[PDB]
Amino acid sequence: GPPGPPGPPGPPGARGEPGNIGFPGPPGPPGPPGRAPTDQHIKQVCMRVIQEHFAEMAASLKRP
Amino acid sequence: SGPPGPPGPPGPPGARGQAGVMGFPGPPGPPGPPGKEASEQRIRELCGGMISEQIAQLAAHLRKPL
Amino acid sequence: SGPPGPPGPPGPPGARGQAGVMGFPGPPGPPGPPGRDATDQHIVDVALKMLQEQLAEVAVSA
């Protein structure tokens, strides 16, 4: 009697490994610049200095 | 009266592995630059008159007669 | 002849699947910290100079 037919195909193979982690991101951008003084701030500091050295101004401006 | 046939063909390749996870964030950026200083000329222009008035008023006050 | 044989055994399992694809690139880091503000000292420096100059100019008139 004739031979039988070949079997069914084998089962699907094993699911592959997880892919690797992606590259790290680029460094963030630089921070914002520090603030520069406004005109009004500058005036306010000058007046402070005047007041803080008023004594020295008076000693210098003293008459005989 | 039949011999079993040969084994079947190889199965299909397995399913692809799961996609990888996103990379870590990058490092913090650099510090921003320091704040710009006002020039001497700008300060002199803004405060010249103030200093002069103050000196004027004070000199006047210290020469007063009662 | 006579009866045909039964179906043979299953084939072998196929190869392992390819590995997963590499993940997405990471996001940019966060901004750096802000730079330091300009201090008042550079203003004080000039104010004191101006004050000195003008006090001298005044004193000069003796």
Author numbering:
A (entry chain A): 3 to 66
B (entry chain C): 2 to 67
C (entry chain B): 2 to 63
Publication passage describing the model:
Two host-guest collagen peptides (GPP)4-(GXY)4-(GPP)3, where (GXY)4 sequences are from the α1 and α2 chains of human type I collagen, were recombinantly linked to chains A, B and C (corresponding to α1, α2 and α3 in collagen nomenclature and omitted here to avoid confusion) of the NC2 domain in the following combinations designated as α1Aα1Bα1C (for short 111), α1Aα1Bα2C (112), α1Aα2Bα1C (121), α2Aα1Bα1C (211) and α2Aα2Bα2C (222). Three unique chains form a parallel α-helical right-handed bundle. The most important observation is that the triple-helical chain stagger is entirely determined by the NC2 domain.
All five constructs were screened for crystallization, but only three of them yielded crystals of sufficient quality, crystal structures for 111, 211 and 121 were independently solved using the MAD phasing from selenomethionine derivatives (thereafter designated as 111sm, 211sm and 121sm) to 2.25 Å, 2.10 Å and 1.6 Å, respectively. Whereas the crystal packing for 111sm and 211sm are similar (two trimers per asymmetric unit), it differs from that for 121nat or 121sm (one trimer per asymmetric unit). Namely, a triple helical chain linked to chain B of the NC2 domain is always in the leading position, the one linked to A is in the middle, and the third one linked to C is in the trailing position. We suggest here to use a rule of BAC-translation: chain B is leading, A is middle, C is trailing. This way, construct 121 (or α1Aα2Bα1 C) translates into staggering order of α2α1α1, whereas 211 translates into α1α2α1. Despite the variations of composition (homo-trimeric for 111) and stagger (121 or 211) that might not represent a native stagger, the regions of sequences derived from type I collagen are well structured. Crystal structures of 111, 121 and 211 constructs demonstrated that a staggering order can be manipulated at least for short native collagenous sequences, meaning that such sequences are rather adaptive to various abnormal conformations.
